[PDB]
Amino acid sequence: KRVLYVGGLEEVDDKVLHAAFIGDITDIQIPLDYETEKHRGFAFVEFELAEDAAAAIDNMNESELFGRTISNPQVYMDIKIGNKPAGRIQMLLRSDVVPMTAENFRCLCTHEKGFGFKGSSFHRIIPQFMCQGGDFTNHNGTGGKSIYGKKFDDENFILKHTGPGLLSMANTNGSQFFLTCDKTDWLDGKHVVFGEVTEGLDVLRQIEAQGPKQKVIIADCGE
Amino acid sequence: GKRGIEKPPFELPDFIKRTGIQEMREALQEKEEQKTMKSKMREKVRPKMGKIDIDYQKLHDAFFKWQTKPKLTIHGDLYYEGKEFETRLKKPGDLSDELRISLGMPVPPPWLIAMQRYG
Numbered sequence: 001k002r003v004l005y006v007g008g009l010e011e012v013d014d015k016v017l018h019a020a021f022i023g024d025i026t027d028i029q030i031p032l033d034y035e036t037e038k039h040r041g042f043a044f045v046e047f048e049l050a051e052d053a054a055a056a057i058d059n060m061n062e063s064e065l066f067g068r069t070i071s072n073p074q075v076y077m078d079i080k081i082g083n084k085p086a087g088r089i090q091m092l093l094r095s096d097v098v099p100m101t102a103e104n105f106r107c108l109c110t111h112e113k114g115f116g117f118k119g120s121s122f123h124r125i126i127p128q129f130m131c132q133g134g135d136f137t138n139h140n141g142t143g144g145k146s147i148y149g150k151k152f153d154d155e156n157f158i159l160k161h162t163g164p165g166l167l168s169m170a171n172t173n174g175s176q177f178f179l180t181c182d183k184t185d186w187l188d189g190k191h192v193v194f195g196e197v198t199e200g201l202d203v204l205r206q207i208e209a210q211g212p213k214q215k216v217i218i219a220d221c222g223e
Numbered sequence: 224g225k226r227g228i229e230k231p232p233f234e235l236p237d238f239i240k241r242t243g244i245q246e247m248r249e250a251l252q253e254k255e256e257q258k259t260m261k262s263k264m265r266e267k268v269r270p271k272m273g274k275i276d277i278d279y280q281k282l283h284d285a286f287f288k289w290q291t292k293p294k295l296t297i298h299g300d301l302y303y304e305g306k307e308f309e310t311r312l313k314k315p316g317d318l319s320d321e322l323r324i325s326l327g328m329p330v331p332p333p334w335l336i337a338m339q340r341y342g
Contacts, residue, residue, distance in 0.1 A: 123327075123333065124333065135336065137331075138331035138333075138335065138336075140326070140327060140328070140331060140332070140333035141333045141334070141336060141337075142328075142331050142332045142333040142334055142335030142336045142337070142338075143331055143335065143336060144336055150336070150339065151336065151339055151340040171336070171337050171340055172337070172340035172341070174336055174340070176336060
């Protein structure tokens, strides 16, 4: 119970969040108005009963040592349909089934390879079949490049697109990744399913309802 | 043995269509159709001026200066019941203009990564 649930502080930064908590070891602020600060020690982790409602850039930030403000990597991409946000798809990319495609989706969300889903759009979206995007080269599913080159093989097809928010590596799998909102067992054996959005399944359903008639692009994304 | 089809009669060349004999020829033919036969031998026994009478050097330049050489085929072409439809040799490994336009492929197809992955 060393992590906090500090909210009420997008204008804040990690240094401004950790300056009040300094010996904080972890400080990961969410894309919404929430952050979690964790101290390594035991006496320094009791900041909720010690510096609650602390002033963070002329704003009070109440700190509670809980997990109310919120392994397989989670590609958390605020997928925006058009100029408005269609929801934050926190697609838990299944590293237990397809770890290479899950790491490719997580790196495309985090934009650590120079290109990826942070800013790309899904130009191959079908109604309750597939929504394929992540290609940052041609922006149509006909470009894209994986970590091994332009084209990479699928890792494993142990998972299946059996429900909403299930993510697969679209194609042979380069930078193309497909989110599924329904059953896609007919395409099994060709696209390796590498995700299941426990959070952002409503965002995947909104992306499937919008898909393309609208520019469904995740401008903000990360791990 | 075609026996069940109908075809357009003719398409005039571009210099003949630029001179435009077809418009007043069709107007004269439709006026003749709306004429009665009583009016036909009435105009036979009393004729009138002005058939087309546009100029001469427009037709002269259409025949000589606006003359375009057509696409003559090879020495070894054999015509048959078909022999006017197999123009795809649509190259293999090459898309179409409609596939470039409707899928947003600039002169990057959306299936290019799948085609390169399949080899």
